[PDB]
Design an enzyme around this catalytic site. Structure first.
Site, PDB file in Angstrom:
ATOM      1  N   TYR A 187       0.794  -1.254   0.000  1.00  0.00           N
ATOM      2  CA  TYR A 187       0.000   0.000   0.000  1.00  0.00           C
ATOM      3  C   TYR A 187       0.838   1.323   0.000  1.00  0.00           C
ATOM      4  O   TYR A 187       0.337   2.352  -0.467  1.00  0.00           O
ATOM      5  CB  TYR A 187      -1.031  -0.027   1.138  1.00  0.00           C
ATOM      6  CG  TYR A 187      -2.222  -0.891   0.784  1.00  0.00           C
ATOM      7  CD1 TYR A 187      -2.344  -2.203   1.263  1.00  0.00           C
ATOM      8  CD2 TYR A 187      -3.216  -0.442  -0.064  1.00  0.00           C
ATOM      9  CE1 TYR A 187      -3.411  -3.016   0.915  1.00  0.00           C
ATOM     10  CE2 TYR A 187      -4.290  -1.252  -0.420  1.00  0.00           C
ATOM     11  CZ  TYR A 187      -4.375  -2.531   0.053  1.00  0.00           C
ATOM     12  OH  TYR A 187      -5.430  -3.319  -0.332  1.00  0.00           O
ATOM     13  N   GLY A 244       2.599   3.906  -1.456  1.00  0.00           N
ATOM     14  CA  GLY A 244       2.784   4.340  -2.794  1.00  0.00           C
ATOM     15  C   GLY A 244       1.567   4.173  -3.644  1.00  0.00           C
ATOM     16  O   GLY A 244       0.448   3.913  -3.212  1.00  0.00           O
ATOM     17  N   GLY A 276       0.267   2.006  -5.163  1.00  0.00           N
ATOM     18  CA  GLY A 276      -0.596   0.860  -4.903  1.00  0.00           C
ATOM     19  C   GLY A 276      -1.928   0.980  -4.162  1.00  0.00           C
ATOM     20  O   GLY A 276      -2.226   2.001  -3.536  1.00  0.00           O
ATOM     21  N   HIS A 287      -3.751   4.997   5.921  1.00  0.00           N
ATOM     22  CA  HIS A 287      -3.509   6.320   5.330  1.00  0.00           C
ATOM     23  C   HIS A 287      -4.263   6.484   4.014  1.00  0.00           C
ATOM     24  O   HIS A 287      -4.862   7.557   3.762  1.00  0.00           O
ATOM     25  CB  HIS A 287      -1.986   6.541   5.101  1.00  0.00           C
ATOM     26  CG  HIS A 287      -1.623   7.934   4.649  1.00  0.00           C
ATOM     27  ND1 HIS A 287      -1.265   8.230   3.348  1.00  0.00           N
ATOM     28  CD2 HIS A 287      -1.638   9.122   5.310  1.00  0.00           C
ATOM     29  CE1 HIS A 287      -0.975   9.522   3.249  1.00  0.00           C
ATOM     30  NE2 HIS A 287      -1.199  10.089   4.423  1.00  0.00           N
ATOM     31  N   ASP A 288      -4.225   5.460   3.151  1.00  0.00           N
ATOM     32  CA  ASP A 288      -5.019   5.487   1.932  1.00  0.00           C
ATOM     33  C   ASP A 288      -6.521   5.601   2.238  1.00  0.00           C
ATOM     34  O   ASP A 288      -7.228   6.327   1.536  1.00  0.00           O
ATOM     35  CB  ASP A 288      -4.826   4.233   1.108  1.00  0.00           C
ATOM     36  CG  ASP A 288      -3.528   4.236   0.292  1.00  0.00           C
ATOM     37  OD1 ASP A 288      -2.700   5.167   0.422  1.00  0.00           O
ATOM     38  OD2 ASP A 288      -3.260   3.294  -0.477  1.00  0.00           O
ATOM     39  N   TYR A 312      -7.384   9.285   3.299  1.00  0.00           N
ATOM     40  CA  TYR A 312      -7.525  10.097   2.098  1.00  0.00           C
ATOM     41  C   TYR A 312      -8.863   9.767   1.416  1.00  0.00           C
ATOM     42  O   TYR A 312      -9.563  10.650   0.965  1.00  0.00           O
ATOM     43  CB  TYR A 312      -6.357   9.777   1.108  1.00  0.00           C
ATOM     44  CG  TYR A 312      -5.067  10.521   1.395  1.00  0.00           C
ATOM     45  CD1 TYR A 312      -4.928  11.313   2.540  1.00  0.00           C
ATOM     46  CD2 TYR A 312      -3.988  10.450   0.507  1.00  0.00           C
ATOM     47  CE1 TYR A 312      -3.720  11.994   2.806  1.00  0.00           C
ATOM     48  CE2 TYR A 312      -2.788  11.145   0.760  1.00  0.00           C
ATOM     49  CZ  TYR A 312      -2.670  11.901   1.897  1.00  0.00           C
ATOM     50  OH  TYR A 312      -1.486  12.580   2.112  1.00  0.00           O
ATOM     51  N   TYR A 355      -0.707  22.286   3.650  1.00  0.00           N
ATOM     52  CA  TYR A 355      -1.130  22.661   5.012  1.00  0.00           C
ATOM     53  C   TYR A 355       0.076  23.077   5.864  1.00  0.00           C
ATOM     54  O   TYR A 355       1.224  22.898   5.461  1.00  0.00           O
ATOM     55  CB  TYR A 355      -1.874  21.492   5.688  1.00  0.00           C
ATOM     56  CG  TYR A 355      -1.049  20.218   5.797  1.00  0.00           C
ATOM     57  CD1 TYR A 355      -0.071  20.013   6.782  1.00  0.00           C
ATOM     58  CD2 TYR A 355      -1.230  19.175   4.894  1.00  0.00           C
ATOM     59  CE1 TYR A 355       0.660  18.804   6.884  1.00  0.00           C
ATOM     60  CE2 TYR A 355      -0.511  17.996   4.980  1.00  0.00           C
ATOM     61  CZ  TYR A 355       0.441  17.795   5.983  1.00  0.00           C
ATOM     62  OH  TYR A 355       1.120  16.597   6.098  1.00  0.00           O
ATOM     63  N   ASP A 413      -2.055  12.490   7.632  1.00  0.00           N
ATOM     64  CA  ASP A 413      -0.592  12.428   7.469  1.00  0.00           C
ATOM     65  C   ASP A 413       0.082  12.260   8.835  1.00  0.00           C
ATOM     66  O   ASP A 413       0.964  11.438   8.973  1.00  0.00           O
ATOM     67  CB  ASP A 413      -0.068  13.672   6.765  1.00  0.00           C
ATOM     68  CG  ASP A 413      -0.369  13.692   5.285  1.00  0.00           C
ATOM     69  OD1 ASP A 413      -1.024  12.761   4.723  1.00  0.00           O
ATOM     70  OD2 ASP A 413       0.023  14.663   4.604  1.00  0.00           O
TER      71      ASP A 413
END
Lengths: 4, 121
Positions: B27, B29, B31, B47-48, B51, B64, B89
């Site tokens: 995951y 990157g 991916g 994290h994905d 988002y 930010y 993040d």
């Protein structure tokens, strides 16, 4: 920069 | 943005985002397929998903501001998209720091075909  | 995210990661872990976390497991990157390979890869998965909770925001380009309060990451007040991006993040950076012990180079440049199975956010 780019982790995508 | 990826600019702020890279700098957090470096600060937190002392590794450079590219190449340490840009092609790791399934995951980190580009991916987005299969079962995450290890804790670090799980950080990237969450994290994905994070988002993914923001449709109308632009995580890669939207900028930010954040500050350090004795090591602590504190997201400064911008648009609602910037605030929520920064929190995603921040969580990833800490997740990375928490799992450093099990980071494995074996998962760097991990091949796509071995990214098997399914996981819903």
């Amino acid at each position: 920069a780019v982790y995508s | 943005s990826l600019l702020e995210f890279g700098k957090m990661i470096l600060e937190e872990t002392g590794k450079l985002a590219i190449p340490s976390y840009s092609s790791y497991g399934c995951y980190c990157g580009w991916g987005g397929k299969g079962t995450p390979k290890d804790a670090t890869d799980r950080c990237c998965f969450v994290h994905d998903c994070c988002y993914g909770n923001l449709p109308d925001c632009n995580p890669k380009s939207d900028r930010y501001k954040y500050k350090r309060v004795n090591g602590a990451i504190v997201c400064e007040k911008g648009t609602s998209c910037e605030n929520r991006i920064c929190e995603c993040d921040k969580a990833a950076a800490i997740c990375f720091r928490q799992n450093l012990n099990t980071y494995s180079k074996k998962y760097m440049l991990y091949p796509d075909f071995l990214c098997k199975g399914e996981l819903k956010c």
